[PDB]
Every structure is written in C-alpha cells, then in structure tokens.
Design a protein around this ligand. Structure first.
Ligand code: DMU
Ligand code: DMU
Ligand code: DMU
Ligand code: DMU
Ligand code: K
Ligand code: K
Ligand code: K
Ligand code: K
Ligand code: K
Ligand code: K
Ligand code: K
Ligand code: K
Ligand code: K
Lengths: 326, 326, 326, 326
C-alpha cells in the first residue's frame, strides 16, 4: 500500500531537495558530474569546448594578421611575408585555427617563419588541442564502460516465494545471468525496508534491516552460471520470524535485493537491484526448474524463469509458531 | 558418468535458450556486448562506422558542390570560388570527407571561406571524427585488457587427491602461477555440484554446495609464489564426510574449483576455474614436490606439477568412519 | 584541546619530515608522483616534453639542411633536391618538426625522397610523437578520474550524538549521498584516536582504536540511498564503555569516521573521511528526520541533515554504570 | 642460514623451470605478456608494428604505381592522371604510406580519384592506423599506471621486534606511507615460511603458515596516516607460541609481511611485501616513536622510523612458558 523505496527495475524512488550547495560540490567533483549527465549534454559540452578554443585562437590569428598588414597582402610577395599565409578575413582565420588544432592542416592557410608570436600561438594551440582531446577521450571512455548497464543483462524473478527447504521455512528469490560472460566475485544482499518507532519513541521513516543470506559463512558469495535460487532461512534472528501467511497478505513492507559483482571484461563492479513488496511474495510456492541435461551439455529454459507452482503442504503459520508448537 | 558443469579448462558447459528479449537487453548494455564479441566483428563494426560517416559527409559535400556549381568549376577562378576546392565528382567528395575526418588533410581538396554551410560541416565532421575515434580507442583498450586471459597463465592440477595430513583426511588440489608477475589479493573457492531432492520432494537439477577451504579464518586467502596445494579438511560439516574410497569410485559428482585475484599490472580481477569429476579424484595419493632449494634461490620444476604418488597407509574408509570407529 | 588528526573535511593533519630518499622513490614511482601534483605542473611537464622533442628534432633537421646545402637552395631546382623542402633556417626547421610530430603537416615544409637520414628521422619522430601523446592521454585520463573527488558529493554530519536506541546507549553519526548515482559496495569504519601509555610504560603518541559499527555481522556494509544514521553500540567491548556525559565534556579524544565505496560510473573506490572531537559530540541528542513520503515517491530534505534535538530521558551516566547499576 | 623466499625489498626469490608450454600460454595471454616486459622491448614491438604496416602499404602503393604507369609520369598531365601523385619510386611510396597512416599528410604525395584500388587502400590503411594507435595507447597507459610501483613509496621497518604490550608477548613490525596521497582499503597479512614434515611423513619444502594480525575482527584493516606498528599477539594459536629468545637466536625461519591497498588516484590495488629472517627479529626491543605534536599539526620524523631501543624487563622465555609458569 505504502509506495516503494526501490522499483522492480532497481531504480531508487527518492528525490533530494534543499541541497543548497550542490552546484559548488558538483563543480568540485566535475568528472563524476560529467559522466553522470546524459550523452546529449556531455557531447554538447565537448562540442562547445572545441568551438570556443577554435574561435579564441581564430580571433588571435585574425588580430595578428590585422596588425601585421596581412589582410591587405594575404599571399605575400618578394618584399612582404605574412605571419600566416592566406588569412584574408575572420573566416579564413577561423579555418586556420580549426585546421591547426584538429591537426587537419590542409595547408593553403599555413604559418610562416616571419612572426614569433604566430609560431608561439601554433605551439600553444597544438598543446591545448592535445589537452582537450585527452579530456574528451577520457570522458567518453569512462561513460562508455559504466558497469551499471550490466544490470540490463542480469535478471531477478518477478516474485519472491516462501516455502520449506531441508526442514526450514525460507524466503526465496531467483537471480540469473543473461550472458555467457561472467559476473566475477558475485555476492548477494537483502534488506527489509519499513518505518519503525523505537522503544524510546524515536521514529525512523525507513529503517533498513538485514536479511541474512549466508554472509557469516561466505555463502552470500555465489558462482552464477545457471539461475540460482537465493535462500533466506527464516529463524529466530530473521525479521520475518513472527510473520505468518495471513500477516504477509495484510502487511506493509518491502524486501530490497542486491546482486553485486564484477563485469568479466572490465573487472568493474556492477550493482543490480530489485524489490519485493509484501504483496509480491507468494507464500506456499516454489520456482519451476529451468536447468536440464542434454546429451553433452546442460541447458537453461528462461521461459520458466519467473514461473512458480503451489505447494499445499507448506505450513501457513510463522516460523516462530513452527518452533513454539514443536 | 553424468556430463560436467564446467570443463577442465574452466569453460562452463551450459547453453541458454528462450531468452526472448535478449536483443533489446544486449543493445541497452551495448558496451558489454561489444567487448564480448570476437575481434573480427568488433573491428568490422568500427570499420563500418568509419565508412558510413565518411560516406554520409561525402554525400553532403557532393550535394553542396552540385548546388553551388562547383562540379563545373572545381578549381575556381577570378570571379568564382568553390565551397571546397577540387571536389569534381563523388569520389573527390568522398576523398575530401576521408581526408577531413581522419585528419590526413592532403590539401589538394581544401575547404574555402566561401560557403558557411561547408565550414559548418567541416566543424561537425571534425567533432564527429573525435567522438568515433574515442569510442574505438575505448573499446579496443577494454578488449585488450580483459583479465580472463590471465587464466591461461594460471594452472590447476589435472587431478585432485584424497590423503591424510596432520591427522585429518583432506581433499587436495594444486594451483600455480606461470608468470613472475603476481596475482594480488588471491583467494580460492570450491563447490560440490550434483542434483538433489530435498526432504520436501523439491528436485534441484544442480545444487552447488560449498567446499570449505578456510574462509572463516581468512585462510582461503593465499600468497601464491610457488605452487600451493589447496586443502579441504573432510570433517563433520563437509559434504564428503560420509564418502569412502569405494563410494568415490562408483559415485557421480563434480568438484568445481576457483582461483580469483587481481592481475598485478592492471589490478583487474581474473577468475580461473577448473573441475574434478568423482573419477578424476585419486584416493590415497599425494602430489610430488616441485619446490627445491639451490645455492642462492629456490626453483620450481613444473614437469612434476601434475604428478602424484600413492600412499598405502591412507585409510580407505570415510572420515565419518574414522571418527565413528575411534 | 589537543589538535586534530583529521580535519572536519577529511584532510589529514600530519606533516612528514626527514624523508631523505624521497626524490629517488618519487622518481621510481613516477606515475603516482605525476597524477598527485596539481594540474598546473602536470600540464607544464607535458608542455615541456613537447617543446623539448620539437626543439631536438628541429635541431636535427636544421643540421641535415646545413650540411646538405639546403639553406642555400631551400626550394630546390632541376639539378638539386633538398632533404626537406623549404627548411631555410632554424625557425623553418622548428616549424617542420612541430608539423611532423603533431601531424599537422601543412606541407609547405615537406620531406623528400633524397636523404635517407631525413626519412629515418621522420619515422623516428612520428613514433616518438605517438609515445609522448600516449603518456599525456594516460596521465590526463587518470588525473581526471581520481575518485577522492567523489567525497565532495558525500556528506558527514557536523556532529555526532550519544542517545538510547532499542535499549542500548549508542554513539551515532549521519552519512548522506548528494548525487542520484550510487556508491556501490559501500561500507563504514570508525576509530578512536588518542595518546596512550601501556602497562609496560610504552608511550603511543596516537593510538588508533576500532569503533565497532557491525563488521562482525556484515552490518558495516550499507545500502546508501537516503541519509543513514550509523550506530556504534557502547557495550563492554567499546572504548567508550566507561565514558559518562561529564567525562565527555571534559575529555580529550577524537573519533575518525570513514565511508568507503565505489563511484558507480567508474567502479573506483573513494574514501570519504571526517572527524568528531570529544567537544563536537552532543550527549542526549538525536538527529532530526530528513526522509518523508509523498504521493508516489519519497523525498529527502537536506536542510535538516545536520539538525539535532535534545532527549531529556537520555541517561547521563556511562554504559558501564547502566549495567553496573542494573 | 637457509636462503630467503622473499627479499627485504619484496622481490620473490624463486625461479620457474621446465614450463614447456609457456610460449603458447604467453601468446594466448598476450596483453599481460606485453605490459610485463620492460619498456625497451614493448616500445620496440610497437615501433616494429608501425614500420611493418608502413612498409607493407608502401609496397602496395608502389605496385599500384608500377602497374598503372605512374613511375614514368608521377605528376600526370592533361591526358594521364596517376593513382597517387608523386609516387616516383619505392622511397616516395614509403613516404606516402607513412604520411597517410600517421595522418601527417604533407600532400605533395596525394591520392587522386583515378584508381578505385588506391582509394580503397587509403581507406584500409586509415582504419588499420587507428587500430594500431589504439593498441599502443592502451599498452602504454596500462604499463604507466602499474600499481606495484607504489610499493616504492611504502616502507617496512628493517627489523621486526618481540616485546610485551598490554600484558601479551607480541611480534611487531612497522609500516609507513611516504606520500600525502593515501592507500585506501589498506590491510595487512603475515606468514611464517619454513620446511615441514607432517606426522604422516609428507615433506613440505616450504609451508606457509598464517601469522594472525586481527583478520577475525577486521583489525587487519588499517587507516594508514602516520607509521603504524603492526601487532601479532603470540598466543596458543600462534606458530611462535613455543619460541623463546634463545630458540629465535638459533632458529631457521622467515616471516613474510604484506601490505595491500588501493593507490588513491587510480583505485588500483598494490601489494607491498617484505621479509624478516629469524636473525632479523630483535627480541626485547621496541620501535622509537616518530609522531609528535606541534602548534597546529602533527609531524613524523622518518629518520627514527627503523630505530629500536632495548627493554630489559622483556621476558626471555616463550609465550607458552609465560602461561605454563603462571
Ligand atoms: C549539471 C548538473 C545536472 O544535474 C543536476 O543536479 C541537481 C542536483 O541533484 C538536480 O537538482 C535536484 O536537486 C536539487 C536539490 O538542491 C533540487 O533543488 C532540484 O529541484 C532537483 O531537480 C538537477 O535537476 C540536475 O539537473
Ligand atoms: C550481437 C550479439 C551476439 O551474441 C549473440 O548472443 C545471443 C544471446 O545469448 C546468442 O543466442 C543464444 O541464446 C539465445 C537465447 O534466446 C538462443 O535463441 C540462441 O539459439 C543462442 O545461440 C547468439 O548465438 C549470439 O550470437
Ligand atoms: C615533484 C614532487 C613534488 O612533491 C614534493 O614531495 C615532497 C616529499 O613529500 C615534499 O616535501 C615534504 O617532505 C619532505 C620530507 O623529506 C620535507 O623535507 C619537506 O620540507 C616537505 O615539504 C615537497 O614539499 C613536495 O613539493
Ligand atoms: C617474450 C616473453 C619474455 O618473458 C620470458 O618468459 C619466460 C617464461 O617465464 C622466461 O623463461 C624462464 O622460464 C622458463 C620455464 O620454461 C625457463 O626455461 C627459462 O630458462 C627461464 O628464463 C624468459 O626468461 C623470459 O624472457
Ligand atoms: K593529423
Ligand atoms: K595535413
Ligand atoms: K567471522
Ligand atoms: K601547392
Ligand atoms: K590522434
Ligand atoms: K581504466
Ligand atoms: K573486496
Ligand atoms: K594532417
Ligand atoms: K597538407
């Protein structure tokens, strides 16, 4: 009923306001800012950087030509050599600047030995060009390689389920890899999200309470080839210990699930997230299998990935009742 | 007898099917897609990107020339200046485009000050060229540096063995580094792979059960210089606790072994994998030593790396029988 | 009263002296040195590298021209071909060098087929140019992407507080993310900093004593969306166990707090730090909430991020007195 | 007496032999191979790649010219247009190739519209040039950024010491950072290295036995600002439990120490190593302090970093005798 902290696709559902000093901080952390903005604006920013550098140096070569008399004798002759051949106006100056900085250098417009200032500006523009190119290459390479995109080829089940396994009542969900390339050093986390009032009267708008999936024995670390069903044993230390089927069907909470690991090609950590509201957890269900053996290999049928089937033998009471009654 | 989850060389033996939305996901995660495809196709993709950009701008300069009258007077004269000198047909237009975007700029074909649209297109093509170059550099650099390749210079023993060490029955295998450069933050994992039916009747096509190699004390973390024999103590918490030599010789299961760590040069995590079927585990054997001391250094003879020798004193019963009988 | 180990902004307050061999070590670890120096000097270093390479090759082409007779016949004729057309003096030689190495190549100054040494030098200069460009690109890209900058968009509360939660006396501080992009694999640490004399009489100028915030259960690992209040339970193993409110108000110590995690875009680890002196810890206070629900989402009001309010019911004695008395 | 596994500077003292398939493996893992070889050879390899590509395309343009008749009419005329202007011999062909691939493009030698094959080869050479440049940039950037170099600005003490602290006998050594930039996520390890025969008679040429420095409580994780003395408590689980001062002075073993963490600028993990032979451990000594307070900051005097002073009260018996006697 209460709206969700993170959406089914992993997007977090929180807006930040009154962050009054954000412009100064985003400027101080400019690179992060640059790679976070969408492609349109980042490429526009670098376009502007090129345009502005080309125009500035264009203006300088035009002024050098103006003062030297080159606009009146752009090709030169036996008794007059221009600072830069064929700068006859602002457009030609702009072209020479572009041709120099891009290093295209068609050469109709061409610096001469005559003016030390012109030679110096070609030196400076060349160095500046290399600097700007380096910034652009770096920004583009970083934005290209962003590992959050890998979450698009990782899959959480639409539902979580509650069912008995090896004598214990467990909360379960499924994760899968949609590529042949791996997620290295892969590991899973989960949290129960809900508001809470402490015994001292402190209101916590959204508390984040750990859902144990094996950390203490390193069993949170998974080797993900075929889809794996992640298990949370509901025992005396679980926050779901006193939750029966009926409680679940009239409760208001959210289970956030996280898969973290490194994109194999780049070794860069991605964080894939999803969320199960109380109403999206199916008590007394198990996932249909997807893995089956063939002649010389195994195969995964992903069309059954999200499918569940009901298990009538599943206890309807809480895990606490299971121990209390026994 | 049943076919293997991962091959001796670490390749996983699972095919994915009915992943109906894969094209849209692979497009959304395009960079991962690009660096995963083989060199042939990635380089072909970038070749096409260059060709297409060169052709498009080629067409634009040709059209500008056509409409301006330049095809009829490509060199210009006292009363007529072309938008781009020497564009006399489509091939010349294409050459000018290539020369501009690559920044070769031979300069026979050369933009003039005459046409604002031509100057604008040189600006746009230059920026576009830098963008495409940046994408290619990024993709090539990423594909070049892929740390999975480092597994080619890491070595697992062909067999695992079962033998007594310091009073305990242990499953053992060997790992080695085939370079002088290190694997930093190196650590080991193992899993027993087999189908299983739970007491509730749930069939698990392939369950993955942890094989303890010291995680709980940080002893899974290794300093790998000379080859190390990795040890799994078969005790009451091991899934091999009730497995005797005879059981092993008529059993059907697989032990997957993993070595993870960072390539020293790049600090990028590699995951090296191998596999031991029940029939590839040699009960009552130990590995021959490879390390020996010389005058001023140690030496490793890798020709004995895979070699084992039998130990007749090795108990033939399970670890459970060892405790039960004593 | 005693001055602080780390400042409120995370900067460490320690100077190093008599590090006599630092120049040799900084040279051996040159890349780290280069990316650590400020932008001004790094860009100046690369400017000098370009200038020096351009001048050196400039000198070589000038000498080739001098010895070949080209200074007297720079354009050549029917019976004489220069090594490089239009090298008529040192400035022209310098221009040709720049034009070759930058790859601008205007082409007025142009190598010919005549002199094998000139052709060889163009080959060598081209390769050298690519090497220097590669070093510059690498250095700039690394310096641009430095993840310490991300700490500018992470926020620690100005104060820490001491208050009761769920029946325990806890030291608390707040951390927040000032961007929509995440800090992946995020985790927290804290240390109490103070001088100490051991029972053996050894003086420790500043000892660093761990402040437990959940490491042993993996609860130091956080999922940071909206601001989180980090909790240190003051129990029998805490170094604050015997510290009452009055002790705190007349004590001399510092609590350093650390948030580490990976910048989402680059997966590069950042370390954000802050510090609370004894006098900056507010006994009997709690943080005002910042998170509230709207129609379809949650919102964080960062203007209340640092705000606290007093809780008169808070015990004034130490946690040790709480157990001792009960 | 027995020679050391790792040298005082961290270099490992082990040679590998009879690695018969190493060439094929080093080729399969070519990038690692390339960045591991010294600068001389890596830069030579890329030099050769340029030379070979320039020569090959040089040969192709020469052959095109030869067959087309261009060698006899290199400048062309009203009734004859060459494939590439001014290719009059092999050197000119080679120059055109260089000028095209480097993108210098002086333009005296210049492709025309005449020959589709010549245009195609300029296309192919341009793409090939970009590919080779990308490989070189990637290799150089990777080699430049190698984090092992950071170990040159990290420091281990020359000696380790044994002394009492807070009532326990401890093995101690010192680590320091020689830069203002940090080692993030820093943590320490240690191992005792020696040969061993198991109770079953198995000879282990060099066993590696963990030296506990706090892993189980996360105290192996350090915040390294000023130099820190790392502590190993010699208790019943330590391999040094039964080692007295006299034992130490006539024993043969080695303690390897490791500091791992991320270079702040690049977030790349470095591994710094050192070693203490039994004879390099000073029983009954402590390190001189280096940290002292000034007016507004702290200062570290690194000239006392390695210095120790004797503590006559230090027990001379083993830690086992300390408990056994008490
Ligand atoms: C160039 C930076 C672009 O990113 C900006 O980041 C701001 C900081 O996150 C956002 O403001 C967001 O956060 C502010 C918090 O001060 C609010 O005032 C704004 O309403 C809210 O859109 C803003 O939209 C977004 O374009
Ligand atoms: C450009 C992307 C190239 O990679 C593709 O990835 C697909 C997705 O993994 C593969 O299809 C594989 O997976 C599909 C699952 O939907 C099956 O339909 C195909 O038979 C199977 O080859 C396909 O071969 C492969 O070229
Ligand atoms: C080029 C390297 C620039 O970095 C240098 O690093 C030195 C090494 O950290 C600093 O010296 C610092 O450390 C030295 C320790 O030997 C002291 O002598 C100096 O006074 C102190 O400024 C010095 O300022 C700084 O420019
Ligand atoms: C290009 C690769 C350069 O690196 C090579 O690596 C080899 C593999 O490590 C070394 O051989 C080393 O290892 C071999 C093991 O097969 C021995 O045969 C050699 O004697 C020993 O120098 C060899 O020196 C070294 O140049
Ligand atoms: K160029
Ligand atoms: K040119
Ligand atoms: K533990
Ligand atoms: K000309
Ligand atoms: K370039
Ligand atoms: K990188
Ligand atoms: K880690
Ligand atoms: K050029
Ligand atoms: K030119």
């Amino acid at each position: 009923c209460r709206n969700r902290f993170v959406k089914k696709n992993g997007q977090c559902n929180v807006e930040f306001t009154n962050m009054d000093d954000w412009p100064q901080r985003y400027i101080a952390d400019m690179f992060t800012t640059c790679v976070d903005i969408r492609w349109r604006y980042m490429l526009l920013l670098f376009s502007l950087a090129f345009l502005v550098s080309w125009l500035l140096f264009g203006l300088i070569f035009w002024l050098i030509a103006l003062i030297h008399g080159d606009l009146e004798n752009p090709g030169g002759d036996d008794t007059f050599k221009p600072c830069v051949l064929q700068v006859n106006g602002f457009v030609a100056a702009f072209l020479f600047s572009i041709e120099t900085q891009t290093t295209i250098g068609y050469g109709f417009r061409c610096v001469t030995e005559e003016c030390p200032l012109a030679v110096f500006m070609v030196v400076v523009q060349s160095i500046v060009g290399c600097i700007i190119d380096s910034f652009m290459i770096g920004a583009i390479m970083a934005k290209m390689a962003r590992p959050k995109k890998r979450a698009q080829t990782l899959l959480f089940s639409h539902n979580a389920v509650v069912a008995m396994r090896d004598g214990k009542l467990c909360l379960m969900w499924r994760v899968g890899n949609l590529r042949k390339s791996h997620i290295v050093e892969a590991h899973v986390r989960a949290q129960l999200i809900k508001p809470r009032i402490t015994e001292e009267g402190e209101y916590i708008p959204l508390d984040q309470i750990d859902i144990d999936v094996g950390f203490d024995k390193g069993l949170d670390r998974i080797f993900l080839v075929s889809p794996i069903t992640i298990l949370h044993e509901i025992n005396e230390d679980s926050p779901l210990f006193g939750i029966s089927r009926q409680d679940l069907e009239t409760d208001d909470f959210e289970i956030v699930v996280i898969l973290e690991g490194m994109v194999e090609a780049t070794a860069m950590t991605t964080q894939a997230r999803s969320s199960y509201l109380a109403s999206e957890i199916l008590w007394g269900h198990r996932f249909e299998p997807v893995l089956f053996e063939e002649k010389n290999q195994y195969k995964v049928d992903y069309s059954h990935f999200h499918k569940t089937y009901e298990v009538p033998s599943t206890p309807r009471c809480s895990a606490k009742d299971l121990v209390e009654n026994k």
